[PDB]
Design a protein around this ligand. Structure first.
Ligand SMILES: [Zn+2]
Ligand SMILES: [Zn+2]
Lengths: 113, 114
DNA sequence: GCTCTACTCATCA
DNA sequence: GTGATGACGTAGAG
């Protein structure tokens, strides 16, 4: 029986993380480790990691799950990305957490001026 | 036989203006009235009339002729629009020739700022 | 804590 | 006198 890669105990994987994101992780372990497994909206990815629309629209770069827009089914679909992929791309791009914060620090300044 | 709408004499229409732009205009009248019949590139339409990419990209709005990009076949194709259509849309948008010139006047100022 | 892009120019294509 | 768009961010519509 294949095991969850975090606990090595559960054998029933979370259907979203497994099927959409290709992660053999159980639902419990996913709540226990949001730092790796939380789902982020497109908008949160841009706020948190400073990724651009072109990066987040690239079908070849991230797995994504889509849902109806909660404000209205007639609006553009909500797009959910998994934190570990988004973060790994953001660290490659800005140079680790070290660099990402530099860019946070940067944007906060011009925020005033 | 049907006659050119500018001269009322010629019977063979310019192939581009007829087939692509639906104007029964002979080639000679087209050279004689560029103020209506000259063909403008996409970039020229933006420069001259302050039309935006969404307006010029709207397939339902203007007739267009496409050619190979003269800088390179591998670049984005060149797009040619006929001045009467582009001008008539621009006068509607900015308010005749008059409003258009105000927008010229306006844009030269912010240019001086920088 | 929703998404998409229009809102004047280098650069690349 | 070539075309398309991303680039300090973001309102507004959707
Ligand atoms: Zn587990
Ligand atoms: Zn004629």
């Amino acid at each position: 029986a294949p095991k969850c890669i975090e606990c090595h105990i559960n054998i029933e994987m979370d259907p979203v993380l497994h099927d959409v994101f290709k992660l053999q992780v159980c639902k419990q372990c996913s709540k226990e480790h949001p730092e790796k497994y939380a789902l982020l909206t497109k908008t949160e990815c841009k706020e948190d990691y400073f990724l651009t629309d072109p990066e987040l629209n690239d079908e070849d770069l991230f797995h994504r799950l889509e849902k109806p827009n909660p404000h209205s089914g007639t609006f553009a679909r909500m797009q959910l990305f998994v934190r570990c992929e988004v973060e790994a791309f953001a660290f490659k791009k800005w140079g680790g957490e070290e660099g990402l914060d530099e860019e946070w620090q940067r944007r906060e300044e011009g925020k005033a001026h």
